[PDB]
Each structure stands twice: as structure tokens, then as C-alpha cells.
Swiss-Prot record:
It comes from the Viruses. Isoform large T antigen forms homohexamers in the presence of ATP. Interacts with host HDAC1. Interacts (via LXCXE domain) with host RB1; the interaction induces the aberrant dissociation of RB1-E2F1 complex thereby disrupting RB1's activity. Interacts (via LXCXE domain) with host pRB-related proteins RBL1 and RBL2. Interacts (via C-terminus) with host TOP1 and POLA1 allowing DNA replication. Interacts with host TP53, inhibiting TP53 binding to DNA. Interacts with host preinitiation complex components TBP, TFIIA and TFIID to regulate transcription initiation. Phosphorylated on both serine and threonine residues. Small t antigen inhibits the dephosphorylation by the AC form of PP2A. Isoform large T antigen is a key early protein essential for both driving viral replication and inducing cellular transformation. Plays a role in viral genome replication by driving entry of quiescent cells into the cell cycle and by autoregulating the synthesis of viral early mRNA. Displays highly oncogenic activities by corrupting the host cellular checkpoint mechanisms that guard cell division and the transcription, replication, and repair of DNA. Participates in the modulation of cellular gene expression preceeding viral DNA replication. The J domain is essential for multiple viral activities, including virion assembly, viral DNA replication, transformation and transcriptional activation. This is Large T antigen.
């Protein structure tokens, strides 16, 4: 087994906040985790946080979840909910600073959409 990723793919890092322990609240987040755990979290996060939009993407044999929330949350709050579900699988949760650029990159090589909550993906959300 290859070592689990320690961060998001290098292509995406500019779009993220790396201050994961901040008290700052945000309304856009991304999670890097296994294919199995991302599939589960897609449904769980959709309901828990009443997402405006959520999408799940292929990323280097893992998955990335991307979502927008109608209320603001600390990144650590999302992490707390998600690590509990991911159990013994790697999981990286970060806030997204550049919402449109992040989502756009996740829809194009080397990434691709697996499923998302709005048809035609987004476009009124950006």
C-alpha cells in the first residue's frame, strides 16, 4: 500500500485555507479521503450541514468532497464530524478560499465528477 496522502494534491493547494485550527468560520469546505469513506460522507454531510451544494470527485485513486453550506462553520467542526466517520482511513479537511476555482479544477483532468447534488454541476452557486 502506498503511503496515505498528507495533504490535498499540489494542484489544489492555492485554493484552500491551511489554517485548519482557526476560529474563523467558512461556508465552503473540501475533504480528501478514501473512495469508500467519501461515498458515505457525501450523504452524511449533505444532511448534517444542510448543504447548498455538494460534489464528490475522483482524485488520484482517492476521492475529494467539495461542499458549500448555508451557515458558517469552523473547519475543525467539520473535521470533528468527519474523522469520527472515516475511522481508520486517512482524512484531510480544509476550508476553501477560492470556491469557484476549486470546484472548476475538480471537474477537469486530472479530476472528475462522480456525483453531485445539482444537475449540470455549478452554475448559480458561483
Amino acid at each position: 500500500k502506498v503511503e496515505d496522502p498528507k495533504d490535498f494534491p499540489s494542484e489544489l493547494l492555492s485554493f484552500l485555507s491551511h489554517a485548519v485550527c482557526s476560529n474563523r468560520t467558512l461556508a465552503c469546505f473540501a475533504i480528501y479521503t478514501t473512495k469508500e469513506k467519501a461515498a458515505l460522507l457525501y450523504k452524511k454531510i449533505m444532511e448534517k450541514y444542510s448543504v447548498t451544494f455538494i460534489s464528490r470527485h475522483n482524485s488520484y485513486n482517492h476521492n475529494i468532497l467539495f461542499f458549500l453550506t448555508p451557515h458558517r462553520h469552523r473547519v475543525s467542526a467539520i473535521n470533528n464530524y468527519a474523522q469520527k466517520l472515516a475511522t481508520f482511513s486517512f482524512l484531510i479537511c480544509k476550508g476553501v478560499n477560492k470556491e469557484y476555482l476549486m470546484y472548476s479544477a475538480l471537474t477537469r483532468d486530472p479530476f472528475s465528477v462522480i456525483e453531485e447534488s445539482l444537475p449540470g454541476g455549478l452554475e448559480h452557486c458561483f
